Amino acid sequence: MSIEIRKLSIEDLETLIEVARESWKWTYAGIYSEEYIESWIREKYSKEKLLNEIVRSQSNLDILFLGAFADSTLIGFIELKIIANKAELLRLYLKPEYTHKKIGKTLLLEAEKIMKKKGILECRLYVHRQNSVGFSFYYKNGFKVEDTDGSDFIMEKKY
Amino acid sequence: MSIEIRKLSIEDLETLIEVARESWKWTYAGIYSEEYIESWIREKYSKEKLLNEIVRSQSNLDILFLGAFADSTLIGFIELKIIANKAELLRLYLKPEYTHKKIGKTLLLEAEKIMKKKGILECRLYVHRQNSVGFSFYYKNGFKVEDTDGSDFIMEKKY
Ligand SMILES: CC(=O)SCCNC(=O)CCNC(=O)[C@H](O)C(C)(C)COP(=O)(O)OP(=O)(O)OC[C@H]1O[C@@H](n2cnc3c(N)ncnc32)[C@H](O)[C@@H]1OP(=O)(O)O
Ligand SMILES: CC(=O)SCCNC(=O)CCNC(=O)[C@H](O)C(C)(C)COP(=O)(O)OP(=O)(O)OC[C@H]1O[C@@H](n2cnc3c(N)ncnc32)[C@H](O)[C@@H]1OP(=O)(O)O
Ligand SMILES: [Cl-]
Ligand SMILES: [Cl-]
Ligand code: NI
Numbered sequence: 001m002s003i004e005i006r007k008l009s010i011e012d013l014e015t016l017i018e019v020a021r022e023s024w025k026w027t028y029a030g031i032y033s034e035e036y037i038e039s040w041i042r043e044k045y046s047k048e049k050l051l052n053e054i055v056r057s058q059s060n061l062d063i064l065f066l067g068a069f070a071d072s073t074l075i076g077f078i079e080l081k082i083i084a085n086k087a088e089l090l091r092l093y094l095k096p097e098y099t100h101k102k103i104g105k106t107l108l109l110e111a112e113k114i115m116k117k118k119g120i121l122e123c124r125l126y127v128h129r130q131n132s133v134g135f136s137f138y139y140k141n142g143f144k145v146e147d148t149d150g151s152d153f154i155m156e157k158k159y
Numbered sequence: 160m161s162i163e164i165r166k167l168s169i170e171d172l173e174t175l176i177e178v179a180r181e182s183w184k185w186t187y188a189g190i191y192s193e194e195y196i197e198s199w200i201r202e203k204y205s206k207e208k209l210l211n212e213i214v215r216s217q218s219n220l221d222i223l224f225l226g227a228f229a230d231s232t233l234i235g236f237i238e239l240k241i242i243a244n245k246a247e248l249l250r251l252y253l254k255p256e257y258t259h260k261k262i263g264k265t266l267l268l269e270a271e272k273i274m275k276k277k278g279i280l281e282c283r284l285y286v287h288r289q290n291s292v293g294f295s296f297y298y299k300n301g302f303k304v305e306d307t308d309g310s311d312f313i314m315e316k317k318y
Pocket of ligand 1: 023027089090091092093094095098099100101102103104105125126127128131132133134135136137140258259
């Protein structure tokens with residue numbers, strides 16, 4: 001199992017949406033309803049929005065959008081948003097069958113490496129409080145809860 | 160997510176084979192080849208063999224064959240073989256998306272409960288040495304390595 005991390009490109013769009021869908025159905029099985037998720041996928045992970053995000057990342061602006069590829073097949077992705085010297089980890093998702101193999105850790109390290117290249121010293125995120133899979137991974141990797149907003153925990157990491 | 164543990168019945172056959180297939184492809188992705196697995200599924204998990212095993216379990220003889228059912232859908236199974244006062248854990252497999260939720264632990268506890276009812280004080284198993292997922296679960300649950308046979312570790316638990 002060879003895993004490559006690289007910036008996503010527009011050709012990654014269609015399988016990106018499928019990874020997102022598959023990871024979302026799994027991750028939130030006890031949190032949101034099947035329809036809530038299908039609408040979320042349709043509205044937030046639309047072809048147009050992701051394309052624009054993939055482009056802003058490729059153009060080296062306010063998005064960093066990396067995928068993990070297993071034998072050329074996209075199986076995970078991370079997306080950060082940069083404003084000034086700070087980042088927000090918007091998204092980190094893998095195909096459920098590819099979890100617990102350090103692939104999430106690998107995407108995070110890559111982003112962190114690029115943030116350090118960019119002078120970004122703070123990174124923060126919003127995680128649904130009932131998402132133990134995600135929440136536990138984050139605190140195991142140096143994120144600390146600093147606040148809440150609705151159902152989410154606001155976690156933050158400094159460098 | 161409601162999980163029920165009960166003895167398998169002949170009507171469980173077709174979805175039993177699919178769980179086995181899906182768990183096998185995942186579990187041994189870096190261990191055996193796609194064909195080795197498809198042959199193993201075809202030859203060891205055949206309709207006839209499993210049926211006979213399900214029957215011997217239902218008849219209360221030398222097999223104990225339990226499934227874990229999530230909302231009426233079979234998602235995992237355990238199978239033990241009894242000879243005298245001792246057992247061998249032949250099989251324990253879940254759909255990959257259902258792992259890491261204590262469902263494996265739940266099947267093991269059920270079998271252990273029945274073994275104790277039956278006076279069975281020793282339980283042993285063979286785990287492929289490169290199966291870290293399975294091997295780690297077993298030692299986290301009181302199994303200790305006592306020997307090897309080919310690629311497998313022979314692990315054993317006493318009560
Ligand atoms: C800001 C946001 O994007 S929030 C949404 C975060 N993403 C999700 O929840 C989607 C579902 N999960 C995933 O995609 C992944 O598990 C990630 C990205 C959260 C973590 O990546 P992975 O490569 O799976 O994790 P990695 O192998 O580095 O670390 C393992 C740890 O993560 C957590 N974890 C990873 N996979 C699993 C799993 N299948 N079941 C339970 N916990 C898991 C555990 O805490 C585990 O620690 P343990 O060994 O003590 O049990
Ligand atoms: C004799 C034989 O049958 S050998 C074949 C054994 N079965 C397999 O390997 C098939 C693949 N795996 C599985 O079906 C299951 O993981 C089982 C049956 C081994 C364990 O059942 P689960 O309900 O998943 O495990 P449970 O939640 O009780 O325990 C979690 C522990 O099991 C292991 N584990 C369970 N799921 C995973 C996973 N997706 N990735 C990595 N490790 C895992 C870990 O050691 C975990 O401990 P951690 O929290 O420290 O990481
Ligand atoms: Cl979340
Ligand atoms: Cl094994
Ligand atoms: Ni774990």
